[PDB]
């Protein structure tokens, strides 16, 4: 489905707003401070995830691997480069529903690969 | 089920406050819905 996103006008750089073309039945975006119009490519407008199953692998930063206060195991090798050190931690996120799942971040410089088991 | 007890619950009964911290309602079942957990979960869905 997609979580969609904003679009900005190209003249006054304001927020475009979705509106309906009544003649051609084509979704348009129009700034309200000028006459600028643009055709909607995505065709979805407002999308809301209530169940909100969230992918934490997107939020996790690779720099986390430098923290002394996080644990690490040589049990789980890196999936990409096959490095033994992995520094694992939990959600660290409020409103996570119920997750004790560990997320893994590969140590060694610049790898930064982030997986979940 | 966490319910209030002790002195905080005593101010509620004494003051007769309109909104208690922990209002609760115990509900007993008549027929076969009392013995069977499945028949009970059915009524459980109707009260919630």
């Amino acid at each position: 489905p997609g979580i969609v996103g904003i679009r900005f006008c190209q003249e006054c750089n304001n927020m475009l707003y979705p509106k309906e073309d009544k003649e051609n039945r084509i979704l348009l975006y129009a700034c309200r401070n000028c006459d600028y119009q643009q055709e909607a490519d995505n065709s979805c407008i407002y999308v809301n995830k209530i169940t909100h199953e969230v992918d934490e692998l997107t939020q996790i930063i690779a720099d986390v691997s430098q923290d002394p206060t996080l644990p690490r195991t040589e049990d789980h090798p890196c999936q990409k480069c096959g490095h033994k050190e992995a520094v694992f931690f939990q959600s660290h996120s409020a409103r996570a529903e119920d997750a004790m799942r560990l997320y893994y971040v590969c140590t060694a410089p610049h790898c930064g690969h982030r997986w979940t088991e | 089920k966490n319910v209030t007890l002790g002195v905080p619950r005593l101010k509620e009964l004494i003051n007769i406050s309109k909104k208690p911290k922990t209002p609760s309602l115990t509900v007993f079942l008549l027929g076969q819905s009392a013995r069977d957990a499945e028949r009970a979960k059915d009524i459980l869905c109707r009260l919630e």
Binding site: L70, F89 | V7, K11
Partner: protein, 50 residues
């Protein structure tokens, strides 16, 4: 302690007896559990008297 340690030692279980003596951290957590006793005794008396 290390981040996200839910083990018994990190979260306050004291495995020592007053006779063998508490280890440094168990001394601090034991002090955190006793403060909750002192506070209650100071607070409840003024409510139970009103």
């Amino acid at each position: 302690f290390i981040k996200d340690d839910y083990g018994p030692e990190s979260r306050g279980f004291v495995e020592n007896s007053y006779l063998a003596g508490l280890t440094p951290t168990e001394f601090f957590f034991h002090a955190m559990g006793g403060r909750e006793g002192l506070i209650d005794t100071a607070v409840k008396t003024a409510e139970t008297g009103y």
